[PDB]
Amino acid sequence: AYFLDFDERALKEWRKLGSTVREQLKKKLVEVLESPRIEANKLRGMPDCYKIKRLVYQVIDEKVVVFVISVGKAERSEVYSEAVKRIL
């Protein structure tokens, strides 16, 4: 029941996550559109910001729009890469 919208920086971020991710995220996002305000996912101190497991979105009631603002990863890309190397 909520419209989707992406911040342009986040859409650019989205186009670099890879094939596998931006699909499982697309799934969880469209699910969020039904009822965006999930208490278990609300960022601390932030009245309108929520997380998807990361992805962050802003709920804009005045427009009924879910605004995806930030999407990325827990660590730097180098940390996962170095972790893969470290175990070889």
Author numbering: 2 to 54, 61 to 95
The authors write:
Binding of RelB inhibits RelE by displacement of the C-terminal, flexible α-helix, which contains a tyrosine residue (Tyr87) that is critical for catalysis (Li et al., 2009).
To better assess the structural rearrangements that take place in RelE upon RelB binding, we determined the structures of isolated RelE present in the two crystal forms obtained for the isolated toxin (P21 and P212121). In the structure of the P212121 crystal form, which has two molecules in the ASU, RelE also forms a domain-swap dimer involving the C-terminal helix; however, this interaction is not symmetrical. The interaction patterns observed between helix α3 and the core domain are identical in the RelE monomer, symmetrical dimer, and one molecule of the asymmetrical dimer, whereas they differ in the other molecule.
